[PDB]
Design a protein around this ligand. Structure first.
Ligand code: HEM
Ligand SMILES: CC[C@H]1OC(=O)[C@H](C)[C@@H](O)[C@H](C)[C@@H](O)[C@@H](C)C[C@@H](C)C(=O)[C@H](C)[C@@H](O)[C@H]1C
Length: 403
């Protein structure tokens, strides 16, 4: 009877209990969000099927007779701005998707990511060197945020003097508040103008960075990245390239800090960090929901999703489905996390997984290694969770360097 409003506090306050209640009733239920009807998928089997069903399109640019396609994530976005944000792998369906992903896969490799390991370690050490030996500091502004932003900038050839503004615009983009739709759309245009210039500079002065490489990437069959494709891929790589890791590092720091046994365990055993990263992602997936558009009627979990429906796959909620992950509310750094959906599922499976695990592992290892008595600077229940279903995270986290 009562259709859930994804804007309500129920989805930002102890929201996993809310997901649990829904999943129990119907793993595929109708919901309201940003003034339109949608379907929320909270069951694991259902979410995995949904992401595996190509009839559920990822392309917001496709047009359908009498329909006005509206992806929640592009709230306040002019059409040209949307196109700049949506002409990449994550916003494409095969065959376009296939060639774009393959072309980008030729340069965004494990080798290139591993080559960065030394940089990630040095950047991590320099940031930690600067916070001191004691007292309180905001681990986000001083570590979780600056590390990923510097790494992605180095990967995409973004000179130092051009790194002080986009962080602000990206932040605004993560929140989908109807009240600030205009400010959100304007932050998006700034990002677009920033990318257009970056591409211009890189075309004019090539380097050994990923963007320079993508500008040259080609293949007999796949062809190459068109100007629009190159610009849009660069844009997403920039944002998705750091915001996710910022969430991972912040949430991971908070989780380990608020779970004595898990904290104590990690401090005693190092080789437990890698799986901890996986469990941190399973427990509180940054990309809580991922959007899809039903190009045809699609039945998921026995529910007929009508054609033209907006579908929100609750990746995060799927990771807490007790049917897939027993005692889903227990943060256990030793649990077998195989199968979680925090990196997606299917053809759109995260392309940056290698880099994310590298950053998370290097960051958490260094932080908890450098400060053995690190502790939260506030009560666990007082942490402020970013109000976003697009990318969950923590934007301010006080910590006591010496306990
Ligand atoms: C912990 C960090 C990360 C998480 C949790 C994460 C998660 C995800 C998820 C859920 C998807 C699937 C989206 C969908 O199904 O529509 C995805 C796709 C993707 N991710 Fe990540 N990601 C992370 C880091 C990265 C990084 C560091 C980069 C860039 C350097 C990146 C680039 C991409 C790209 C380009 C895709 C598009 C895949 C495609 O459509 O073929 N990711 N990511
Ligand atoms: C504002 C809308 C966009 O969001 C962002 O770029 C966010 C900053 C990123 O954190 C998102 C959440 C990523 O981490 C991945 C899950 C998906 C990504 C790779 C896509 O391709 C996807 C089309 C995406 O660009 C849009 C949803």
């Amino acid at each position: 009877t009562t259709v859930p409003d994804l804007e309500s506090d129920s989805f930002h306050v102890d929201w996993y209990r809310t997901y649990a209640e829904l999943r129990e009733t119907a793993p595929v239920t109708p919901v309201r969000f940003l003034g339109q009807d949608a379907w929320l998928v909270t069951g694991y089997d259902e979410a995995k099927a949904a992401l595996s069903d190509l009839r559920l399109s990822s392309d917001p640019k496709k047009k359908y007779p009498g329909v006005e396609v509206e992806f929640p994530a592009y709230l306040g976005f002019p059409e040209d701005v949307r196109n700049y944000f949506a002409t990449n792998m994550g916003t494409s369906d095969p065959p376009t998707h296939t060639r774009l992903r393959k072309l980008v896969s030729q340069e965004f490799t494990v080798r290139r990511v591993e080559a960065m390991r030394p940089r990630v370690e040095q950047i991590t050490a320099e940031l930690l060197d600067e916070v001191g030996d004691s007292g309180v500091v905001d681990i986000v502004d001083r570590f979780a945020h600056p590390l990923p932003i510097k790494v992605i900038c180095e990967l995409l050839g973004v000179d130092e003097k051009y790194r002080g503004e986009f962080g602000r615009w990206s932040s605004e983009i993560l929140v989908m508040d109807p009240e600030r739709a205009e400010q959100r759309g304007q932050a998006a245009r700034e990002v677009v103008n920033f990318i257009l210039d970056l591409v211009e500079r890189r075309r004019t002065e090539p380097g050994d960075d990923l963007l320079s490489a993508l500008i040259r990437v080609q293949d007999d069959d796949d062809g190459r990245l068109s100007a629009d494709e190159l610009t849009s891929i660069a844009l997403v790589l920039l944002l998705a390239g750091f915001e996710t890791s910022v969430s991972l590092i912040g949430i991971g720091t908070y989780l380990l800090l608020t779970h004595p046994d898990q904290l104590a365990l990690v401090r005693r055993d190092p080789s437990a960090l890698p799986n901890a990263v996986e469990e941190i992602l399973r427990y509180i997936a940054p990309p809580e929901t991922t959007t899809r558009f039903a190009a045809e009627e699609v039945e998921i979990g026995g529910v007929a999703i009508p054609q033209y429906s907006t579908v929100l796959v609750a990746n995060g909620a799927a990771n807490r489905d007790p049917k897939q992950f027993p005692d889903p509310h227990r943060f256990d750094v030793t649990r077998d996390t195989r199968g979680h959906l925090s990196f997606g599922q299917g053809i759109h499976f995260c392309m940056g997984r290698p880099l994310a695990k590298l950053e998370g592992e290097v960051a958490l290892r260094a932080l908890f290694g450098r400060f053995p008595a690190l502790s939260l600077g506030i009560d666990a229940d007082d942490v402020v969770w970013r109000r976003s279903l697009l990318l969950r995270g923590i934007d301010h986290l006080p910590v006591r360097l010496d306990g």
